[PDB]
């Protein structure tokens, strides 16, 4: 007994054909691999019964994995990915519609010190009094 899973992924903007390039979807991670269509859709066949996590892998805009439960009779139940808990959290319709949030942060941020902010230093403030006193002399 074999079944198929189809889904549709919509990017907020850009171009679907721009994002299709170098885009694949994983069901277990190395066992079953699906490829996307020209606009966007993952269609996977040759699957057994069981529970699998569908995740779209992309160096570009990332996606949230979605848990899918396959029954032998032919019922398909999709849920949120939960590891600590193993119950039903929220049930959503079957036609997978992933919405990528955006580019994940790959690099860290480093900030410099502001000009108005470096005036708070214990040493910089002890020079401002001599600076003002010496400025008020020629004036």
């Amino acid at each position: 007994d074999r079944f198929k899973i189809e889904g549709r992924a919509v990017v907020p903007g850009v171009k679907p054909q721009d994002w299709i390039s170098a885009a694949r979807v994983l069901v277990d991670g190395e066992e079953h691999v699906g490829f996307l269509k020209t606009d966007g859709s993952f269609v996977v066949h040759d699957i057994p019964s069981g529970s699998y996590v569908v995740e779209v892998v992309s160096p570009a805009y990332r996606f949230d994995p979605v848990r899918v439960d396959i029954t032998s009779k032919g019922k398909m139940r999709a849920r949120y990915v939960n590891y600590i808990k193993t119950s039903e959290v929220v049930r959503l319709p079957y036609p997978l519609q992933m919405k990528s949030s955006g580019p994940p942060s790959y690099f860290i941020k480093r900030e410099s010190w502001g000009w108005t902010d470096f005036l708070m230093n214990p040493m910089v403030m002890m020079m401002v009094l001599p600076l003002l006193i010496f400025v008020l002399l020629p004036k």
């Binding site: 054909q17 299709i20 390039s21 170098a22 694949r24 190395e30 691999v33 490829f35 996307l36 269509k37 020209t38 269609v43 066949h45 040759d46 790959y106 690099f107 860290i108 480093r110």
Partner: protein, 128 residues
């Protein structure tokens, strides 16, 4: 910090497997060059420069091997595994044009059959 030093002291070299089924069509032939290797990866090289435009990797344990690969004017057709799943790709862009499931047979040969004017159908002959 990582954004500031993009490629200061790092490098990546991309390779692909042994060439098994490579075609040299595309009468326009801007830079396109398709190659399907023996490690369940289909790549596209550039005649002018040589870099990789679009490549795809499905499998590599024991299944998903490319058996036959036919080429139309702008659309490329290929069969994976051993006659179960068949998907057609494009050359102007990278992605899937259409997919088709097959029955439980042994892939032996495939060809193009043209009705009267041009090719309308592909014929796939299995063991039985």
């Amino acid at each position: 910090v990582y954004e500031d030093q993009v490629g200061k002291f790092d490098w990546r070299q991309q390779y692909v497997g042994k060439v098994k089924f490579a075609s040299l069509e595309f009468s326009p032939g801007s830079k396109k060059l398709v190659v399907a290797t023996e490690k369940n990866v289909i790549a596209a090289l550039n005649s002018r420069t040589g870099e990789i435009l679009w490549r795809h990797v499905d499998k590599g344990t024991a299944e998903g091997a490319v058996d036959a690969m036919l080429l139309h004017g702008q659309d490329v057709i290929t069969v994976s595994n051993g006659g179960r799943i068949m998907r057609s790709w494009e050359t102007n862009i990278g992605g899937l044009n259409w997919e088709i499931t097959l029955d439980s047979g042994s892939f032996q040969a495939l060809g193009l059959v043209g009705l009267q004017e041009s090719v309308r159908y592909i014929a796939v002959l299995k063991k039985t």
